[PDB]
RNA sequence: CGGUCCGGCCGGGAACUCAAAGGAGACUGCCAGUGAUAAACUGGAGGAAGGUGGGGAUGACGUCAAGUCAUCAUGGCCCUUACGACCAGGGCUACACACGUGCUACAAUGGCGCAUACAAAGAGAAGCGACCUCGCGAGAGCAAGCGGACCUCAUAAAGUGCGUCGUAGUCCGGAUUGGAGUCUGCAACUCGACUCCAUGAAGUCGGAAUCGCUAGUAAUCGUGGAUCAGAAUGCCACGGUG
């Protein structure tokens, strides 16, 4: 169809000058309050240095350069019929997709302090185990047995 | 001192009445200032405006009450007697106050 | 639980997690200690020789437990007169206020499957 | 709407004129939280328990051109299915449609 | 603990009892007001009360006295 | 610019504002690229800003014999002691029975108290009802201000700060319930609202499947009013966070 649309790249964070931290607090934004999210993420290092977090240069990069998503699953129509087909992840959600996989895994966990649930979820990404890193692997293992369509 | 509560439901009717009472005041030699316009007061509603059901047919209506006071500061009596029995544009109401 | 029977172990919280047990309610348990000039924080260790046992009688500023079910029963045998409207609604599988006949009714009439 | 519903209400308003009109605060000389449990104002209550056909209820504003109770606009005395006719027929001051 | 310290009452039915105790085998004394209270000296009498389409008989007992008449009689159908 | 109960409180004034009015302003005209240097388009310059700017608003012949006699006029058919309609009861929240649609929790980016900041638009004279009083309270008295920018309803809330509870089917969160009170009304059975002690069941954020939203849009919290004796969660409007 028509359009061709205008797009937004959002303001950087007012303490660190990071637009990646800004997109993280936007995915961490519930009930529209937005100041609450600043007090949950990057509000302590003493809770990452409590588990697997090694030096501050990795206190956020464990969600950025530690992973590379490429594809998403579901079905697509080709000619007269529908098939299961892996689709090419878009190049600006590429670096902001794992943010939902970390925020959801912490938000839905039953373990009290949310600022500590998030630091513990970042520690469990710094070991490269289970949550978020297997949600990347599961669809790549699927796409290594599904190649005929794009 | 006197004030004259000149009220109407239309923004031109009150200007065409101001152009009669303030001109009568100046031509009768009254010492007068520029009269205040006052903040407009409103009444509004949105209702189902179709004769039988047809629930999409909800429409907005509004009506506006305009008031001026004229306000005479000077105690002179002969200069303002020409205003109290004066005829103004049809549909306006007048009441005299302090 | 020194609050009940002849037992003497009392190293518990006096307002936290002390709710709906031993005749304790849910809100008077806080006010009775403040009005006695007692701090409610930290597990009890320094309130010996009747200093909190004296208040556990009146926390509990009315009849509790098996003597409260006795008290509620002083007007309940009216429901066993059966000719009376409230009693007839109590022998039947029905509500008596704030519920309708087919919209959200199974929670008092009885479940399906 | 049966025509008796307004024809009876006008007679009830004329009857409230001896019991409630400038007398709806008259309870303020017999109401008390205790009064030492005495009785000295029953001269008011003998007349407040007298009427039955007049009351602070049983009234419906209706339209001054149709006996219909619902769809009414109090300050005009007309309906939501009559003011759009009147405002285009030029029968009411201050009110108009469109422009504005 | 009833609504106000003074009860709202009318003696229009109590005034019939000294004649309703000599009715013989005739059909019982019939009434339409159901909000009416039943006084203790109305005990041992049969009364016919409106069910919403007919009138049905009730006998005044030590469970009915001190309460309203309508609390002892049916008001709806499907029974 | 003067006074300086030190306060727009006054003398006074029309300055961002605010409340009001008047005059300009936008035409593809100006410039480039495109295209029969035709028509016409996308951008750029100016400018507060365009290119059916945005919002209101008119309905060519032809459609759906569109909708409504439960809102009227008026012909026909019917009634006219009746299908008239006033009383004492009352019906319209039926029901042994199937299904939608919407709200709020399950908590700890939560719950609570104290400290802490900004409203906006409405409504209101036998009205809204301040300061003050009794009671934990519903609420009842005492008694000003205000008819619209020196009042009342009415400390804006979510938020910001700090301490604290911590999966226990929990002070969370909710159905049901005993006792005692507060209120308008012939009337508070069937068949009303509100407050406080006493009791507190479920609830693990939901499975196939199905539904909706594209930027100040989704989501989130608060203010107000109409109907309105007393009584909806519904409804028509106004702001904050985003």
């Amino acid at each position: 169809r028509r359009r061709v649309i205008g797009q937004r790249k959002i303001l950087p964070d007012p303490k660190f000058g990071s637009e990646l931290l800004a997109k993280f607090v936007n995915i961490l934004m519930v009930d529209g309050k937005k100041s609450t999210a600043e007090s949950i993420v990057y509000s302590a290092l003493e809770t990452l240095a409590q588990r697997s977090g090694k030096s501050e240069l990795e206190a956020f990069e464990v969600a950025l350069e530690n992973v590379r998503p490429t594809v998403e699953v579901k079905s697509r129509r080709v000619g007269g019929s529908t098939y299961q087909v892996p689709v090419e992840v878009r190049p600006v959600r590429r670096n902001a997709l794992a943010m939902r996989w970390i925020v959801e895994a912490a938000r839905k966990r039953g373990d009290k302090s949310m600022a500590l649930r998030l630091a513990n979820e970042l520690s469990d990404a710094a070991e490269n185990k289970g949550t978020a890193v297997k949600k990347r692997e599961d669809v790549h293992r699927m796409a290594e047995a599904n190649k005929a369509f794009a | 001192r006197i004030r004259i509560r000149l009220k109407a439901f239309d923004h031109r009717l009150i200007d065409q009445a101001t152009a009669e009472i303030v001109e009568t005041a100046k031509r009768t030699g009254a010492q007068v200032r520029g009269p205040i316009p006052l903040p407009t007061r409103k009444e509004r509603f949105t209702v189902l405006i179709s004769p039988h059901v047809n629930k999409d047919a909800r429409d907005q209506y509004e009506i506006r009450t305009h008031l001026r006071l004229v306000d005479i500061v000077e105690p002179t009596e002969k200069t303002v007697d020409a205003l109290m029995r004066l005829d103004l544009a049809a549909g306006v109401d007048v009441q005299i106050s302090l | 639980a020194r609050i009940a029977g002849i037992n003497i172990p009392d190293h518990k919280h006096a307002v936290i997690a002390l709710t709906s047990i031993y005749g304790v309610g849910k809100t008077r348990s806080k006010a009775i200690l403040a009005a006695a000039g007692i701090a409610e924080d930290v597990k009890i260790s320094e309130l010996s020789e009747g200093q909190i046992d004296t208040l556990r009688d009146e926390v509990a500023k009315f009849v509790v437990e098996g003597d409260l079910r006795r008290e509620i029963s002083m007007s309940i045998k009216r429901l066993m007169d059966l000719g009376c409207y409230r009693g007839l609604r109590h022998r039947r599988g029905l509500p008596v206020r704030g519920q309708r006949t087919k919209t959200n009714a199974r929670t008092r009439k009885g479940p399906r499957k | 709407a049966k025509q008796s519903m307004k024809a009876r209400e006008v007679k009830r308003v004329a009857l409230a004129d001896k019991y409630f009109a400038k007398r709806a605060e008259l309870k303020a000389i017999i109401s008390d939280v205790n009064a030492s449990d005495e009785d000295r104002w029953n001269a008011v209550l003998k007349l407040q328990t007298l009427p039955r056909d007049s009351s602070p209820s049983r009234q419906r504003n209706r339209c001054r051109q149709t006996g219909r109770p619902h769809g009414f606009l109090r300050k005009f005395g007309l309906s939501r299915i009559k003011v759009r006719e009147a405002a285009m027929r030029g029968e009411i001051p201050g009110l108009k449609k469109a422009s504005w | 603990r009833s609504l106000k310290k003074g009860p709202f009452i009318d003696l229009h039915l109590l005034k019939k009892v000294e004649k309703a105790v000599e009715s013989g085998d005739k059909k019982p004394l019939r009434t339409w007001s159901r909000r009416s209270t039943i006084f203790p000296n109305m005990i041992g009498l049969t009364i016919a009360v409106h069910n919403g389409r007919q009138h049905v008989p009730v006998f005044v007992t030590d469970e009915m006295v001190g309460h309203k008449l309508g609390e002892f009689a049916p008001t709806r159908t499907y029974r």
Side-chain angles (χ1 to χ4, degrees), chain C residues 14-79:
Chain C
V15 191
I16 308 307
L18 190 80
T19 43
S20 312
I21 57 179
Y22 312 120
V24 184
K26 243 177 176 185
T27 54
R28 189 179 294 273
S29 55
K30 189 178 167 72
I32 194 168
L33 299 178
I38 302 174
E40 55 172 89
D41 303 285
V42 193
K43 288 189 179 197
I44 304 309
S45 291
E46 302 188 337
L47 302 181
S48 68
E49 312 202 284
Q51 286 174 105
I52 188 164
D53 183 89
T54 192
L55 301 178
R56 288 168 175 159
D57 187 74
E58 298 183 84
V59 70
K61 216 170 183 183
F62 190 67
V63 294
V64 303
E65 309 187 305
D67 204 45
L68 176 66
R69 294 178 187 148
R70 184 76 280 281
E71 197 71 20
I72 292 165
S73 300
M74 305 181 80
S75 65
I76 215 163
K77 301 301 193 184
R78 301 292 179 170
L79 307 182

Side-chain angles (χ1 to χ4, degrees), chain B residues 7-97:
Chain B
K7 61 191 183 192
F9 306 126
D10 179 84
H11 74 297
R12 302 295 182 178
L13 193 70
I14 198 164
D15 176 62
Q16 294 166 16
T18 301
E20 192 78 84
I21 200 171
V22 181
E23 291 294 338
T24 307
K26 293 178 303 189
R27 298 191 309 249
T28 321
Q31 285 194 290
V32 297
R33 310 194 320 148
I36 71 172
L38 287 174
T40 318
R41 302 194 73 244
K42 186 169 59 174
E43 173 74 288
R44 47 149 285 281
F45 55 91
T46 300
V47 296
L48 184 65
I49 212 75
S50 48
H52 191 277
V53 200
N54 196 354
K55 71 181 183 183
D56 205 71
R58 309 180 193 282
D59 195 22
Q60 187 267 12
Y61 288 80
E62 64 184 90
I63 64 178
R64 301 173 191 160
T65 304
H66 303 278
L67 173 66
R68 291 182 183 186
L69 298 178
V70 188
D71 183 68
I72 313 298
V73 187
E74 305 299 350
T76 322
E77 196 177 56
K78 299 190 298 191
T79 50
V80 296
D81 178 64
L83 311 180
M84 305 189 189
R85 302 177 300 289
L86 182 69
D87 172 80
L88 300 177
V92 310
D93 194 81
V94 293
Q95 185 192 20
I96 197 171
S97 64

